[PDB]
C-alpha cells in the first residue's frame, strides 16, 4: 500500500519486484584442467630437450 497513480490521497498495492539477472557460463572453469602455478617474477623460462 504505497500510493495511487496521479493522486496522493488514494492507495494502490505494490505487489512486488521482478528481478531479471544475466546468464553466465562456467563449463570450462568447472572442468578444472589448469593447475595454479604462483610465481614472483613477471616472466618465466622453460627448457625444451629432445633425444630423437
Amino acid at each position: 500500500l504505497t500510493n495511487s497513480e496521479k493522486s496522493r490521497f488514494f492507495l494502490a498495492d505494490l505487489t512486488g519486484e521482478v528481478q531479471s539477472i544475466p546468464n553466465t557460463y562456467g563449463y570450462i572453469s568447472g572442468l578444472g584442467l589448469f593447475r595454479s602455478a604462483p610465481q614472483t617474477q613477471t616472466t618465466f623460462l622453460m627448457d625444451l630437450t629432445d633425444w630423437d
Partner: protein, 52 residues
C-alpha cells in the same frame, strides 16, 4: 379596577364593579429535518489525512 366615588348617606345610592374578560389563543410550531447518506465509494481506497 377603578377609584371609588363619594355618595350621600340618605340617598342610599352606590356603585358597582365591572366583570372580567377572558380570551383564547393558539400556537403553531416549527419543523426541521436533516438527511444524510453513507456510500462505500467514500471508504474504498481513500487515504486517511495525516497518515502515509
Amino acid at each position: 379596577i377603578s377609584l371609588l366615588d363619594a355618595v350621600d348617606r340618605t340617598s342610599r345610592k352606590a356603585e358597582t364593579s365591572a366583570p372580567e374578560r377572558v380570551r383564547q389563543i393558539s400556537f403553531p410550531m416549527m419543523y426541521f429535518k436533516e438527511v444524510e447518506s453513507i456510500t462505500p465509494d467514500e471508504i474504498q481506497g481513500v487515504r486517511q489525512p495525516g497518515t502515509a
